[PDB]
Design a protein around this ligand. Sequence first.
Ligand SMILES: [Cl-]
Ligand SMILES: [Cl-]
Ligand SMILES: [Mg+2]
Lengths: 291, 291
Amino acid sequence: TIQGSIVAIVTPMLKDGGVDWKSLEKLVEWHIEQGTNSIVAVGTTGEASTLSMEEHTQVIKEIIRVANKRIPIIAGTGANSTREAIELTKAAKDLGADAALLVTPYYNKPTQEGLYQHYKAIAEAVELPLILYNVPGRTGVDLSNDTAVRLAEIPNIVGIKDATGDVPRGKALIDALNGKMAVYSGDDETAWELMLLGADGNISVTANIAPKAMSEVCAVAIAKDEQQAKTLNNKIANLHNILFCESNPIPVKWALHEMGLIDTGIRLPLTPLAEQYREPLRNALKDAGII
Amino acid sequence: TIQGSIVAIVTPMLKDGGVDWKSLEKLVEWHIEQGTNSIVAVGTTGEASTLSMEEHTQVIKEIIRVANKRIPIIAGTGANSTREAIELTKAAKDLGADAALLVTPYYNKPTQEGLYQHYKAIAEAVELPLILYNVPGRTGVDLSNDTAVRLAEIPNIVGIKDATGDVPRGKALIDALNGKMAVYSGDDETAWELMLLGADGNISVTANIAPKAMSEVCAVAIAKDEQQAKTLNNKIANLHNILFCESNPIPVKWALHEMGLIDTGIRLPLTPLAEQYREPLRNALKDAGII
Ligand SMILES: [Cl-]
Ligand SMILES: [Cl-]
Ligand SMILES: [Mg+2]
């Protein structure tokens, strides 16, 4: 069901690190006005790692409140402990989230069967649509297409965010699934191609700063309009590269501060974008017509 | 200062995953009797990821209580949030831990400067000996030798566990530090090599099942006896390989179970060692004279 441009939203913070509730409310409003189709609250780009459990609950609560039913809200509820993933996922269900996004357990490297059991335990514990999320470069683990295809058989498991950026592999996954669950790109550089190949949307970093552009790229790609998807994506292609010059969300948070939309807060061990990269990032925003 | 065989001890668990307190006490006792030189409590091999905050404290307190100051106890206190690491490290100091072992933030991929600020902030917040821990395959980030060398200048940063298994790089790190802080192997397969080159010990998985033999390997290797180090390590070299046929601590817990020392409990998303590996494991243990 959830389709189109799904922003992996940052969590705006004041200089001391506190959540900037005013800026967040404004950012959600702007996404809705510009065409973003859905918001992932407190995922990787929203610094899930350095927000407390109460801060997760509050950010999800506020985004749902401001959205006011206009678009679906997906809560990031991943953990590397199955028991913890369950508690987070239950809390998101109770807050009224439309779905949960659950990165594979990171750092502890479960087996493929361990991945299967982890997600099946969560699906069986919480009645809420769940979206798998594979990002092997961050986690230390790769949820294979074979394991994804198995998990798609579990009630409540409704999609996977594939951040491999490996388009032949994502095509092979979409073809094997034959509709049984959704595939979302988690790689802005190749998302337009995965959507042209049958992905249901793009859970996007770039949409944080170009929401109207990315909403258009997703609509034309989902519609299978290859030329329009190529042309529209080309206008923002350089943004997809520059937003990872340091680990996301470091650059995207700097881009939003340059746009005047958030302040500079970001939580250790993350750091504001290194000084040397701020001019090149400004130049990319200017080239793109964003500032 | 802490030298020798430092076991990264498992956290024994009952079938239902509850911590097995009696079996943990017995293990701590057997290590001390067998010649183990120090214990890391609630590290990666100890399932830090799946233990609650209260359980992290109880396990630390129990290992300290049982060891009764006969050997230094190092508390695993890493987190991917600098705030949470400071909290865990303070708690370990308060419980009487001799040192803390802090893996680089995983999953959120800080920059080298963010890793520097992370550990600087902890060292300044907590007056306790800190050991860095780099294992890039699990965490998605690699703390470079250059960054390690900067950090060794910071007062209470007293060492690093280098789990790269890359011996020339570990030698380059030892050489560059020139004694400013300790290097510990985090790779059983190469640990004897790294200690012959100047590492102060081995923060060891294999020591969970061969604590006497690994105590002797570390001692002769630290003594720079290359022949005896090689000879002694050969007897346990196949154990270093077999204990990683699925992600540690999966194989090591199974081994301790075959030895009659712990029950099969292990917490999702980890799983009990797959059946196909159990007979080979058992044969390796028989071959090494462990069972
Ligand atoms: Cl996300
Ligand atoms: Cl450890
Ligand atoms: Mg590391």
